[PDB]
Amino acid sequence: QSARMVAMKAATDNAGQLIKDLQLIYNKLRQAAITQEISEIVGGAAAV
Amino acid sequence: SSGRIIQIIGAVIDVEFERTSVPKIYDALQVDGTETTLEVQQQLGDGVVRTIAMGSTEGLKRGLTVTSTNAPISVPVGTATLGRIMDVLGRPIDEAGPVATEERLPIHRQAPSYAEQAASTDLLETGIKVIDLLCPFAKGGKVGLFGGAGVGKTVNMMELINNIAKAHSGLSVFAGVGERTREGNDFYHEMKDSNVLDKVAMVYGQMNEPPGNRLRVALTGLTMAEYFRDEKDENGKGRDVLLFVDNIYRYTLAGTEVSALLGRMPSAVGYQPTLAEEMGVLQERITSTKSGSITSIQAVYVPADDLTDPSPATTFAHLDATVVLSRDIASSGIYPAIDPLDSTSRQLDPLVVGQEHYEIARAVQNVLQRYKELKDIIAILGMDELAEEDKLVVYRARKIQRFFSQPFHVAEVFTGAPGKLVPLKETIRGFKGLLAGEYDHIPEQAFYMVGGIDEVIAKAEKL
Amino acid sequence: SSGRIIQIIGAVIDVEFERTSVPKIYDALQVDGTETTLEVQQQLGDGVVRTIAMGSTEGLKRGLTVTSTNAPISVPVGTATLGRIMDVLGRPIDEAGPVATEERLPIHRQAPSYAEQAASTDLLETGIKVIDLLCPFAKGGKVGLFGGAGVGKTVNMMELINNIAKAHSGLSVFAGVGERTREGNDFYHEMKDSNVLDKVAMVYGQMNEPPGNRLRVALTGLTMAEYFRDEKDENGKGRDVLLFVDNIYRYTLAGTEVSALLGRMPSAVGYQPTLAEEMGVLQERITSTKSGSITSIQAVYVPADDLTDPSPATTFAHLDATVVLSRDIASSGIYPAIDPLDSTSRQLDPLVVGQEHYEIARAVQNVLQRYKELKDIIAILGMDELAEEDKLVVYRARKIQRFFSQPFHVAEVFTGAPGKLVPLKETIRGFKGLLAGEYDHIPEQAFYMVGGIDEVIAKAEKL
Amino acid sequence: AKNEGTIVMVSDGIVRIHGLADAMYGEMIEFDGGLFGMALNLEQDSVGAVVLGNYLSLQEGQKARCTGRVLEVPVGPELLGRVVDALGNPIDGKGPIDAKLTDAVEKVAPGVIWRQSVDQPVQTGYKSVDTMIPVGRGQRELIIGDRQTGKTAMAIDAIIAQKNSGIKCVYVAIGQKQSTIANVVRKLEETGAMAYTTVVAAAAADPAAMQYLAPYSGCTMGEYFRDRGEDALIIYDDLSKQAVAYRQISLLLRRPPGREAYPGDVFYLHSRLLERASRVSAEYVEKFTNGAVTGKTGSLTALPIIETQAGDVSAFVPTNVISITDGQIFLETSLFNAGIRPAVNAGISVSRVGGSAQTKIIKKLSGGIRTALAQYRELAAFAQFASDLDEATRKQLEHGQRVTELMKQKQYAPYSIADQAVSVYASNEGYMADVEVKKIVDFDAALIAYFRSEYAPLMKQIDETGDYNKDIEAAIKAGIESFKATQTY
Amino acid sequence: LIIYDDLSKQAVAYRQISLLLRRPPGREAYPGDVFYLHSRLLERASRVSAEYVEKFTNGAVTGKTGSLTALPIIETQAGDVSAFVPTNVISITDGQIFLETSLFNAGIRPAVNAGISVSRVGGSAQTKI
Amino acid sequence: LIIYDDLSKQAVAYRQISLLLRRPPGREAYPGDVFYLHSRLLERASRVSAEYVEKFTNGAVTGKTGSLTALPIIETQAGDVSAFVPTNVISITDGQIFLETSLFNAGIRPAVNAGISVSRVGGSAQTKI
Numbered sequence A: 001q002s003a004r005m006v007a008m009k010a011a012t013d014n015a016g017q018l019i020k021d022l023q024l025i026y027n028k029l030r031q032a033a034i035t036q037e038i039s040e041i042v043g044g045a046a047a048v
Numbered sequence B, C: 001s002s003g004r005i006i007q008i009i010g011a012v013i014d015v016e017f018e019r020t021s022v023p024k025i026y027d028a029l030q031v032d033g034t035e036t037t038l039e040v041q042q043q044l045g046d047g048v049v050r051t052i053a054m055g056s057t058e059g060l061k062r063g064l065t066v067t068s069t070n071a072p073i074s075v076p077v078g079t080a081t082l083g084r085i086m087d088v089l090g091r092p093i094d095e096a097g098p099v100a101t102e103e104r105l106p107i108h109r110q111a112p113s114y115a116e117q118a119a120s121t122d123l124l125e126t127g128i129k130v131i132d133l134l135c136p137f138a139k140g141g142k143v144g145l146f147g148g149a150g151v152g153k154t155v156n157m158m159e160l161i162n163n164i165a166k167a168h169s170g171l172s173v174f175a176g177v178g179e180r181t182r183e184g185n186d187f188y189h190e191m192k193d194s195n196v197l198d199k200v201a202m203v204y205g206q207m208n209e210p211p212g213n214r215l216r217v218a219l220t221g222l223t224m225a226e227y228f229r230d231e232k233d234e235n236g237k238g239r240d241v242l243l244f245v246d247n248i249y250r251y252t253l254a255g256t257e258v259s260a261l262l263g264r265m266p267s268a269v270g271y272q273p274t275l276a277e278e279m280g281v282l283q284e285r286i287t288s289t290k291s292g293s294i295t296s297i298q299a300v301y302v303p304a305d306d307l308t309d310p311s312p313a314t315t316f317a318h319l320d321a322t323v324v325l326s327r328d329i330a331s332s333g334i335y336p337a338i339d340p341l342d343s344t345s346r347q348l349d350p351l352v353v354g355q356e357h358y359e360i361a362r363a364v365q366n367v368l369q370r371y372k373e374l375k376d377i378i379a380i381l382g383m384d385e386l387a388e389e390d391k392l393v394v395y396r397a398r399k400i401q402r403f404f405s406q407p408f409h410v411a412e413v414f415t416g417a418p419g420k421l422v423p424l425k426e427t428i429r430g431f432k433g434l435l436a437g438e439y440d441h442i443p444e445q446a447f448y449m450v451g452g453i454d455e456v457i458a459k460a461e462k463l
Numbered sequence D: 001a002k003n004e005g006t007i008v009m010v011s012d013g014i015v016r017i018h019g020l021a022d023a024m025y026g027e028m029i030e031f032d033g034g035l036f037g038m039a040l041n042l043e044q045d046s047v048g049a050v051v052l053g054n055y056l057s058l059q060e061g062q063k064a065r066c067t068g069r070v071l072e073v074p075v076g077p078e079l080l081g082r083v084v085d086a087l088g089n090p091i092d093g094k095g096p097i098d099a100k101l102t103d104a105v106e107k108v109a110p111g112v113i114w115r116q117s118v119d120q121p122v123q124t125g126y127k128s129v130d131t132m133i134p135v136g137r138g139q140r141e142l143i144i145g146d147r148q149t150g151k152t153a154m155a156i157d158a159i160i161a162q163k164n165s166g167i168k169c170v171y172v173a174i175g176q177k178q179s180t181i182a183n184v185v186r187k188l189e190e191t192g193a194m195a196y197t198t199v200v201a202a203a204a205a206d207p208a209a210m211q212y213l214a215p216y217s218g219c220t221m222g223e224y225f226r227d228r229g230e231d232a233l234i235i236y237d238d239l240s241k242q243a244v245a246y247r248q249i250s251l252l253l254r255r256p257p258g259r260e261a262y263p264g265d266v267f268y269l270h271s272r273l274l275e276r277a278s279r280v281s282a283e284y285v286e287k288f289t290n291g292a293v294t295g296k297t298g299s300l301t302a303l304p305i306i307e308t309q310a311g312d313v314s315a316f317v318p319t320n321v322i323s324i325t326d327g328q329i330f331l332e333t334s335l336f337n338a339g340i341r342p343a344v345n346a347g348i349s350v351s352r353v354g355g356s357a358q359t360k361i362i363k364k365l366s367g368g369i370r371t372a373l374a375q376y377r378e379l380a381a382f383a384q385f386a387s388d389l390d391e392a393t394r395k396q397l398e399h400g401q402r403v404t405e406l407m408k409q410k411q412y413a414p415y416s417i418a419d420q421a422v423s424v425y426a427s428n429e430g431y432m433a434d435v436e437v438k439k440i441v442d443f444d445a446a447l448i449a450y451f452r453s454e455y456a457p458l459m460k461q462i463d464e465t466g467d468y469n470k471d472i473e474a475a476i477k478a479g480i481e482s483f484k485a486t487q488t489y
Numbered sequence E, F: 001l002i003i004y005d006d007l008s009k010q011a012v013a014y015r016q017i018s019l020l021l022r023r024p025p026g027r028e029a030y031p032g033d034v035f036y037l038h039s040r041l042l043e044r045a046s047r048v049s050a051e052y053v054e055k056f057t058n059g060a061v062t063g064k065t066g067s068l069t070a071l072p073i074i075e076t077q078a079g080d081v082s083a084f085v086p087t088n089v090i091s092i093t094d095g096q097i098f099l100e101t102s103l104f105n106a107g108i109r110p111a112v113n114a115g116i117s118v119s120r121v122g123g124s125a126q127t128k129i
């Protein structure tokens, strides 16, 4: 039982840390994504 | 009067008429000395009209002369169009002679009003195990098929044509389709063998045609089907008309291709700014008004295999039954590859399909959804670290997932097994027995492509 | 017959000439009373041309007179450019006096035709036995040096420069714009005192220089390398040449700067450029013609996780070989610091190099992979916990990783030995013998900095 | 005045011309010095044109005039074993080509009423393709994969495998280095496959236009045999480079940009080309040849190649082109590096013609084995988490492993129809149920060698006649049984 | 009480009109004055005081207060509430009711998610019991 | 010895000027030319030789060598050194000093991470002791 505790505890901790890093990546992509479309849209405004 | 071409770019041609003769919008123009004709799209002022060529551009130069017909593109309609194949402008391509008809209708027309609108009341039976259970059809309704490339849209549409449109009283079906010329030609010959051709009309346009042709092909099929819907003989009031369209996306693609050249800013994901209105003006004409009933089946293409694209997202609101095909299930070996979830029908109501059917459908969907959320835990935790009820749910969900697959009559060439056709009551009884907990000992292998339950019981012996 | 500047924006200088005479594309123009010179990128009509300034841009105002040379920018080429440093226009900057060469060549030229290509794919043999067996080069191929700032990346360049001239009698050319890091002595000083200056020509540029100078540096070198290759000996055979066009800057520009070696600009010229024609032409000029070959070596800086497959592939797509420098290997006292696992080449194919060499390779890499996987277990405990047939693997891996060391001639100032030039066949024989397990009884450290296996045996015997 | 004009702008291969009032779309124009161009847009006061050749010798003010003819390319049986550029001019220096006929480069495909269903097989030499993704005369398959995954090898193997089939082959190379083209030609000549092959080269040194009109000229060359009751085959080495060249040439012509830069009509560009590869009915043949040949049907098989970026099957071109062809052969880098040399992904790769393009023995032996692998993939992916397995799951897993390891083949090693039939029969019958998971390639290699040494007339009859009878089936079963004992691996 | 069935389609129509009129583009091609579009509409749902009603009717009605309640509806794609228009309109309203797709399939028919749904007025808008 | 307090704010100002000059934005956060902006400045820091000093001073000073040392400072967002601007500057410098915030909060006042920071010129700069 005690051993399971420790093992399970570790998992939870790891999961928590994992989430954090993913969040960071997500935010980056989000910002990056937006910028791209704007540029393309601006290109359309110059297409005429 | 006569206009003169002043500028051509790709398929977009502008023509400068005199001040008093400027043709109106959508009017058809004939180019003298050539088989090409033009249609108006914009009025850029100063007697100049932007137009799209309805045909191929060969040997066209600036300074040529054009004559105005002062009317939209008209097509022949009537009983003499039955058993014939025609192009977009209504000319035969079957090498069987000219169509002997004098009744003609304009391609462009307004949608029916709110006052003339009807209500679907009768169910339609197809013989598909998954369609009849989780997505019932209705006579005079609307059905849509959503999938990415190579998932089985064409096979399902052909099976639907075979099941219901093969033999019914005066169905006067109609088939406005385009796609691959190999699948075409195979179809015209397949029907000519059955003799169904004397009660079908086919409008066909290849996918190598200029963007002018691919933009107006559907508006011809709709025009020909409306005449069958509205015509009445001695109070006969016509007969149920069936419509099958396989080229809806090509319409949006042609619109996108010509939008930039016509001088319009881009919107969203490289899409035209007027997507929703262009879809609406088309999908509001495919309807069953009080004077007649039209049952239509459409094929909808999903780019990049994501349903959030602006093209398939706008279409969901225009259908009564939507069947969504999933790439994962298709790659899993199961066909027809229909997603039990994300597949709904407005007729799935306890006051329409009864009480037992509604409960069976709800229970099946609940079991599948519950099994869907357990995949991450099994990925992280061992399979033994689950509740017994969860294990039962997983096993029953796997059996049910295999159970939605049946062999088709049309796809015999791919596999060799003969087709099957299961009645609704057999499906209801089989699913009721499965959810009850009987059929548990039977291995999940015996549920693949096996029609009704009794064949499952028989196949349990072998494998 | 003289022009006047009418517009000066960024690097672009529109100049206008009379109707009768307009300079052709790539012609060189001289501005009166100012050091600057211009090159004609494109024509815009009405006797107006667009140009990029090459000479220093100081006191440039609208309305200055410009004359035309009616010829492309020509650069001096010969044997008198060896050991000299020059700017893009080929004027000396090392204060050593003029250049005795009186013959010039234009810098814009068509690529060799299809009939001038090589009969077969030959390999360039260098003195580094790590490269010659793990990632062999090809005559006319392209090589990319991936590594961090910890390794100077210059000792290997000097060693290659010395080795090609020592073995195949081939001179080399180095063209660079700016220095990313100056921690080591400057390259001119590092060559001058290594006695390799006589065999190399140098072209240099500064960031703080007209933007036109930063571009066109590779063209000035490629011309010199082409002149060096075609010149023939009394027998009539040509000479092989190495072009060290080091990557000028990081992927911020590299993505559009490494493409400058193929004809694309790193956002240097805002107004319309004409480098699409330059693409391919600048890339199809580094080939092995029947007479001789020109092999290009290009460095690159990668911070982390942006090399080989996970790289953006903007540069990795066209590279025929990649040599990866590992900081950990350098910190372990191994030189040169080239990691065998990460380094890859397209010439490691049984058809092009032979089944013997191919089977000799991919066997040492298996040992490296096994040792890398067992490192943690070796870290956990020593050979005592280790079982049989893995201690031998560990010993062989250590022996080969120590045998990868080799003395260099460039370090003769600090080396008692004059360095070694091991033939490829000798390396193959030694590696095959060591893989056979015969040399297992040879004590360790006899493969360290003893170069060839034959020398290793003598070292093992003496101690 | 109506036929001559002056250049007003030269930039990056695009030339703007004044005058030329009576100029057609796609018409050829001649420049001083023997340089030809084509007109692609005719605005109110100017004509935009692209130069077919080196444009660096053109200057503002040079005269130009319209020829009055559409672009044409020489075509005939004398172009076999020859290497030419996009305009058909020889580049291998073996002498001038004795051209007898010239054919237009741009033309429309035959109508739906003039076509016929495909029912004849095209052999590639790969077990994984001849059994799971059949190819027939007149079907346009597609090869799609990431860089350095083995796309070019399969096309060359397909070209080589037609030594005895009597069908001609055409190879088009776009945006490739000259060294690779030379190596390909050397390999083609080494194996003797050059006796019935033409090569069209548009390398990176060539202008953008040459990289944009190469497939059309190649298809026009290949249509000569299609229109005359014979079978042909054409391979485009890369169409993505054509897309890039078209994007550049359109952007330089002042046309509005679209999604991912590509302007409109990219789908039209790739569809008006692939729609010309079809099987045509006899009556069209007699009508075209005016009765010289009767009772003959033509064909034209196409194998375009598309490369993806980091396994992206969701971009503009990769999605646009998939919806045009009749199937895809999909290649993984994950399987290429794993060890599976013919890295073909089952389940995601389909053939729409199906069993209608196979021999009788192959059609009936290889019945629904693609579905077995597709189900096996998921079953093996799921069974790792299962605590215990029923007997049915273990049998399916073992059969899937054996089938996956069976369909591995070496380059430049084609297999005959009889070899494929024997292997498929042995797999289906389960004669290797006891053979170890490893040493499978040794087993079937030795089996094929043994049936080639003995039972020779049976294999010759199988190869010449694709037939399966009780007496044809019995000998194959007896031979495998005889090979099962009294033999070594 | 007033109910708008989809403000997303109104936003799409406004974007189409603005793009066809050449107004300058922005994230998702939406024009600059798009937040103001919904802001000036949703701010008209208010409860006036008795003095306002007394003044408007010129003494016809005394001692009575009016009101107007709004229930706008918004559709999101794949649950991306971070899109431009959902974020624009969430910051304007006084609360949110979130309906989940997973809860609908799981059997919870009203499918209201408690945990991310809030009402700013709170318990002041309830009867005693 | 020159110390630039923050070159990132200089990058922001340059981006503002470029965008106000109606130059295309591009697919990156900052324009590409920003790279040159941080190179032309950082190239000018070098040590000249004794001969250059005499040539420049016309013989007024002999037997001496000039010098110029630069210490630019760059700020990162949430410890991201992979961003456009931080990546450019790292590639064109002779050494880096990494200051972590976790060490700063956790008691350690001068938070110089020695695991990543490096000078790349050792011994030659330092005195004999």
Ligand SMILES: Nc1ncnc2c1ncn2[C@@H]1O[C@H](COP(=O)(O)OP(=O)(O)OP(=O)(O)O)[C@@H](O)[C@H]1O
Pocket: C349, D146, D147, D148, D149, D150, D151, D152, D153, D154, D341, D342, D409, D410, D411
């Ligand atoms: N079936 C096979 N068995 C063994 N090796 C193979 C096989 N197919 C390809 N290869 C090898 O894999 C490599 C792939 O080369 P290939 O020219 O086929 O790639 P590609 O996809 O055309 O690349 P590129 O993008 O450069 O055109 C070559 O070294 C080739 O010899």
Ligand SMILES: Nc1ncnc2c1ncn2[C@@H]1O[C@H](COP(=O)(O)OP(=O)(O)O)[C@@H](O)[C@H]1O
Pocket: B148, B149, B150, B151, B152, B153, B154, B155, B156, B335, B336, B407, B408, B411, B414, B415, D350, D351, D352
């Ligand atoms: N019931 C079925 N049985 C066997 N194969 C099927 C079935 N349904 C679809 N397929 C396969 O799926 C593929 C889908 O092709 P098709 O429907 O013509 O294209 P799309 O899915 O784009 O309309 C076919 O090649 C066929 O092999």
Ligand SMILES: [Mg+2]
Pocket: D151, D152
């Ligand atoms: Mg290739």
